[PDB]
Design an enzyme around this catalytic site. Structure first.
Site, mmCIF file in Angstrom:
data_model
loop_
_atom_site.group_PDB
_atom_site.id
_atom_site.type_symbol
_atom_site.label_atom_id
_atom_site.label_comp_id
_atom_site.label_asym_id
_atom_site.label_seq_id
_atom_site.Cartn_x
_atom_site.Cartn_y
_atom_site.Cartn_z
ATOM 1 N N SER B 138 0.827 -1.198 0.000
ATOM 2 C CA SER B 138 0.000 0.000 0.000
ATOM 3 C C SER B 138 0.865 1.253 0.000
ATOM 4 C CB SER B 138 -0.931 0.011 1.215
ATOM 5 O OG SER B 138 -1.566 1.274 1.339
ATOM 6 N N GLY B 139 0.510 2.200 -0.861
ATOM 7 C CA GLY B 139 1.275 3.425 -1.016
ATOM 8 C C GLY B 139 2.538 3.284 -1.856
ATOM 9 N N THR B 143 -1.297 2.487 -8.234
ATOM 10 C CA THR B 143 -2.473 3.016 -8.919
ATOM 11 C C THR B 143 -2.081 4.013 -10.010
ATOM 12 O OG1 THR B 143 -3.495 3.012 -6.697
ATOM 13 C CG2 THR B 143 -4.857 3.764 -8.551
ATOM 14 N N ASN B 185 -3.909 -0.230 5.100
ATOM 15 C CA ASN B 185 -4.367 0.601 3.991
ATOM 16 C C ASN B 185 -5.856 0.894 4.080
ATOM 17 O OD1 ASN B 185 -4.604 1.920 1.540
ATOM 18 N ND2 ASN B 185 -4.579 0.031 0.335
ATOM 19 N N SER B 188 -7.825 -0.522 0.304
ATOM 20 C CA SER B 188 -7.184 -1.705 -0.269
ATOM 21 C C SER B 188 -8.117 -2.447 -1.229
ATOM 22 C CB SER B 188 -6.719 -2.628 0.864
ATOM 23 O OG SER B 188 -6.162 -3.835 0.378
ATOM 24 N N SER B 189 -7.574 -2.906 -2.352
ATOM 25 C CA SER B 189 -8.333 -3.723 -3.306
ATOM 26 C C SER B 189 -8.323 -5.194 -2.880
ATOM 27 C CB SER B 189 -7.735 -3.605 -4.706
ATOM 28 O OG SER B 189 -8.450 -4.408 -5.628
ATOM 29 N N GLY B 400 -0.488 -8.499 -2.674
ATOM 30 C CA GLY B 400 0.822 -9.137 -2.628
ATOM 31 C C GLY B 400 1.087 -10.019 -1.407
ATOM 32 N N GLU B 402 2.176 -11.316 2.100
ATOM 33 C CA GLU B 402 1.988 -10.584 3.352
ATOM 34 C C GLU B 402 2.105 -11.497 4.564
ATOM 35 O OE1 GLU B 402 -2.165 -9.183 3.346
ATOM 36 O OE2 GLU B 402 -2.705 -11.009 4.474
#
Ligand code: CA
Ligand code: CA
Ligand code: CA
Lengths: 146, 737
Positions: B138-139, B143, B185, B188-189, B400, B402
């Protein structure tokens, strides 16, 4: 359709077309090198020849495509007349021997950078019979040397 | 005396000199110490230009580049993309878009455009669809990076039309039903998004298509602390008009079991912004409300409670749930009594206990929402349809690798997904290296893959997933019996161990039957197995299934562990993999430079962890099996001519390198002379550098021995070039008459 040795020799020749070593040649380099050795192809003749082997179609051909472009159905000892023609490119005054001055001219046309003595060295090296110049027999011997 | 890289808790690595002791400018384990680049000031666009290609030198290189605002670095054809955290001027300029067009990789500086142009080029030439696989936490800038790929493709090879801005417009709809807040996040998707740009027979852009995979179903009913259900739920509860709020009997999310509990989360506003975007899309109030009805229906479903009554066993709905039941029945277009019977009995009418009815409630909820998401993605696809296409170029985005202090089934599935994606990553890099070597006139790269870690998970009968199914099928399923079955069946497995052997003290208290460690591509993960059996089961019985299929609401009718969650996950993961395997692949790895969203801060140890989780470390190890270092002739001419007599320095770069290697007597096993570059086995670029820096006199001598060869090389070059010109002349005349 070529020997391992012919492919190797053409590979180094390709580096004279591909000066910046990106592995690809355009119509510009094709044309420049041919004219420097006394040919006069038309832009269209070069394009038509490139399009015929350019898989990408970006107008930039690579080494194996270069080889294909050179290939054609050949008569018996046409290759031999090709080698005699290559020799006449060096033997500018057509007396059958290549002199220092003449080698220098070719080296210069092709953009090779060397000293007058280096040119003389090259002559000496291919001059088996020591008459100070390179004849056809010596030329071909040098050309196909291992 | 050579500077090495050694572990550094906050920068991953630091320069210094079973284990080893390191002096900076400290005990360290041998296999965590890497050769460094001599010139620490230097910077290369392709890390394969380095003498040592390892995690340390890689991290050091992209750092240096980061400072110069050089965010894009290659590893072969792989792109590393570090988030700048500010708008670097003109790099995504329209001009730049033209400068990348049709340019082979590595004739321009590293850039997502080049990755993008290459995919198109291969698509066009090879007539093969393409996939661009992006990783990153995340970040990481994932995107934005996706936007660029799509923008680039559309302005470059589209026809004035605007599919990207279209996809950009439609995306807020995906995020509403497909994203949720997590611990790491806020947005998050939770599904796999393969955004495809499709192309006609002449390689012109003609439409889009969002393929989707593996929506996370468990989140629909249950989330952990710090986590929430999908955005849409909370938005609707906080944003709906006092009217809609009444029709759907909404209210505070705290009033719904399915919605666990954050100020920066602007549900009220994001709901308004969401509707705004829905209208721009051509989504009228009718299907808007149809969407909201199902969402509410699921929320009420989830509120239905149960209890044992003693009713000639079976359970019944708590009378307190009467309202949730009528509301739910109402919104889902079902008969209140039919629904009730089907939530507390199964079909021969088997009554259900409390837990079983809870599972029936949740199973319905998961299926309904999942079909709703299917529909939502289909409408998005209608915002940019095409009639037909020949090929596409797709960007894949999916959660991803984790791990946390506590890992459950959710992390298991996700990490299993990335284990198979990593196998794919490795295979395709191996393939790229092999084809690079063939293309250059040079070999099988040595690599053992992680097929065994995959088989531990999915092997028939004995794989963890199948052993889990087996447990669900037993009279009294037990997590502990399941866990022990896993250990007993993979006795001396490279990839499995008991938690007691963890490299972490926090895990060593877990009992053998309470967990297992999987050695994943990115590192060992310890999974606690409580609830694995419950989380593996989300099956909806046929009678409840029939019920929803036959809803009075036409919209719902149109939406429509014998088969375990694990098994469906595998099936779906395999469909995604089927699609990827049908394309040519390229990879982008996004990197989050730090937590605080701040520019010019490079958290070494934190970027290093990401390199590892993305499988980059795994890929470098793979590259050690081939020729990991490669340098253009011109580049080597520049570096080394100063060490050699002026005679060599007069040669052109290719012949200079030829001469050099002939004179050093460099064997042709370890050093490879390609069409455009010299290729080096591991260690060998460095060896070559040492030789070059050794005794200048002995060096000039070796050159002498090469003098005849050099002269004969000079002749043959011009002689064969003359012959080429003569063949080209004969070819033109051939093609004429
Ligand atoms: Ca060139
Ligand atoms: Ca002459
Ligand atoms: Ca002679």
């Amino acid at each position: 359709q070529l020997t391992e040795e012919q492919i190797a020799e053409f590979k180094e020749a390709f580096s004279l077309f591909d000066k910046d070593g990106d592995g690809t040649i355009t119509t510009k380099e094709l044309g420049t090198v041919m004219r420097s050795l006394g040919q006069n192809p038309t832009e269209a003749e070069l394009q038509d020849m490139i399009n015929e082997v350019d898989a990408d179609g970006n107008g930039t051909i690579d080494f194996p495509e270069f080889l294909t472009m050179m290939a054609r159905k050949m008569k018996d000892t046409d290759s031999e007349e090709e080698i005699r023609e290559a020799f006449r490119v060096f033997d500018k005054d057509g007396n059958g021997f290549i002199s220092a001055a003449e080698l220098r001219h070719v080296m210069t046309n092709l953009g090779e950078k060397l000293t007058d003595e280096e040119v003389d060295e090259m002559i000496r090296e291919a001059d088996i019979d020591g008459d100070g110049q390179v004849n056809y027999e010596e030329f071909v011997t040098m050309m196909t040397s291992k | 005396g050579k500077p090495v890289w050694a572990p550094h808790p906050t920068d991953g690595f630091q320069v210094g000199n079973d284990s080893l002791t390191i002096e900076p400018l400290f005990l360290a384990l041998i296999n965590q110490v890497f050769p460094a680049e001599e010139d620490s000031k230097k910077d290369v666009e392709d890390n394969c230009s380095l003498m040592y290609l390892n995690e340390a030198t890689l991290l050091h290189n992209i750092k240096v580049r980061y400072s110069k605002d050089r965010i894009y670095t290659y590893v072969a054809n792989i792109l590393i993309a570090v988030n700048p955290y500010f708008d670097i001027p003109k790099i995504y300029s329209s001009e730049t878009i033209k400068s990348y067009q049709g340019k082979s990789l590595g004739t321009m500086p590293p850039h997502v455009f080049a990755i993008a142009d290459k995919a198109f080029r291969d698509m066009k030439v090879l007539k093969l669809s393409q996939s661009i696989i992006v990783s990153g936490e995340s970040g990481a800038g994932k995107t934005e990076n996706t936007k660029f790929v799509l923008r680039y493709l559309t302005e470059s090879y589209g026809t004035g039309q605007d599919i990207d801005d279209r996809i950009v417009e439609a995306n807020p709809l995906l995020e509403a039903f497909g994203n949720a807040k997590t611990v790491r996040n806020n947005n998050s998707s939770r599904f796999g998004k393969f955004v495809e740009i499709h192309f006609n027979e002449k390689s012109s852009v003609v439409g889009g298509f969002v393929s989707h995979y593996l929506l996370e179903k468990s989140r629909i009913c249950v989330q952990g602390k710090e986590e929430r259900n999908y955005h849409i739920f909370y938005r609707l509860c906080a944003g709906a008009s006092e009217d809609i709020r009444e029709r759907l009997h909404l209210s505070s999310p705290d009033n719904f079991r399915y919605l666990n509990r954050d100020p920066l989360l602007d549900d009220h506003g994001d709901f308004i912004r969401m509707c705004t975007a829905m209208k721009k899309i051509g989504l009228d109030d009718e299907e808007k409300l149809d969407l909201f009805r199902v969402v509410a229906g699921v929320l009420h479903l989830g509120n239905i409670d149960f209890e044992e009554a003693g009713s000639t066993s079976g359970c019944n709905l708590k009378n307190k749930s009467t309202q949730a039941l009528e509301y739910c029945a109402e919104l889902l277009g079902l008969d209140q009594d039919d629904l009730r019977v089907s939530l507390t009995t199964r079909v021969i009418k088997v009554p259900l206990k409390v837990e079983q009815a809870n599972n029936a409630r949740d199973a319905l909820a998961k299926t309904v929402y999942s079909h709703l998401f299917d529909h939502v993605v289909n409408r998005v696809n209608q915002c940019f349809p095409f009639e037909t296409s020949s090929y596409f170029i797709g960007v894949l985005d999916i959660a991803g690798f984790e791990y946390f202090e506590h890992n459950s089934f959710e992390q298991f599935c996700i990490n299993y997904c990335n284990e198979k994606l990593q196998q794919f990553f490795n295979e395709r890099i191996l393939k790229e290296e092999q084809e690079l070597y063939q293309k250059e006139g040079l070999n099988e790269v040595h690599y053992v893959d992680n097929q065994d870690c995959i088989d531990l998970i999915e092997a028939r009968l004995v794989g963890i997933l199948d052993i889990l199914d087996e447990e669900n099928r037993l009279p009294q399923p037990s997590d502990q019996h399941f866990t022990s079955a896993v250990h007993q069946k993979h006795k001396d497995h490279f990839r499995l161990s008991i938690p007691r052997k963890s490299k972490l003290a926090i895990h060593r208290n877990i009992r053998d039957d309470e967990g297992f460690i999987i050695r994943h591509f990115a590192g060992a993960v310890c999974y606690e197995t409580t609830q694995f059996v419950e989380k593996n089961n989300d099956a909806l019985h046929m009678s409840l299934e029939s019920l929803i299929c036959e809803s009075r609401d036409k919209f719902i009718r149109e939406l429509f562990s014998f088969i375990s969650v694990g098994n469906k996950f595998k099936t779906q993961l395999n469909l995604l993999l089927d699609k990827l395997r049908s394309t040519g692949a390229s990879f982008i790895r996004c990197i989050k430079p730090n937590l605080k969203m701040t520019s010019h801060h490079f958290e070494g140890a934190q970027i290093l962890s990401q390199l590892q989780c993305s499988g980059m470390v795994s890929v470098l190890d793979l590259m050690q099996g081939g020729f990991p270092s490669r340098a253009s002739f011109h580049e080597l001419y520049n570096m080394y001519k100063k060490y050699m007599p002026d005679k060599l320095a007069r040669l052109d770069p290719r012949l200079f390198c030829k001469a050099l290697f002939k004179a050093l007597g460099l064997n042709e096993i370890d050093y490879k002379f390609g069409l455009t570059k010299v290729f080096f086995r591991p260690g060998k670029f460095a060896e070559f550098d040492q030789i070059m820096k050794s005794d200048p006199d002995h060096l000039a001598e070796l050159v002498k021995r090469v003098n005849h060869w050099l002269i004969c090389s000079r002749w043959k070059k011009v002689q064969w070039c003359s012959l080429s010109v003569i063949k080209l002349k004969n070819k033109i005349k051939y093609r004429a008459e």
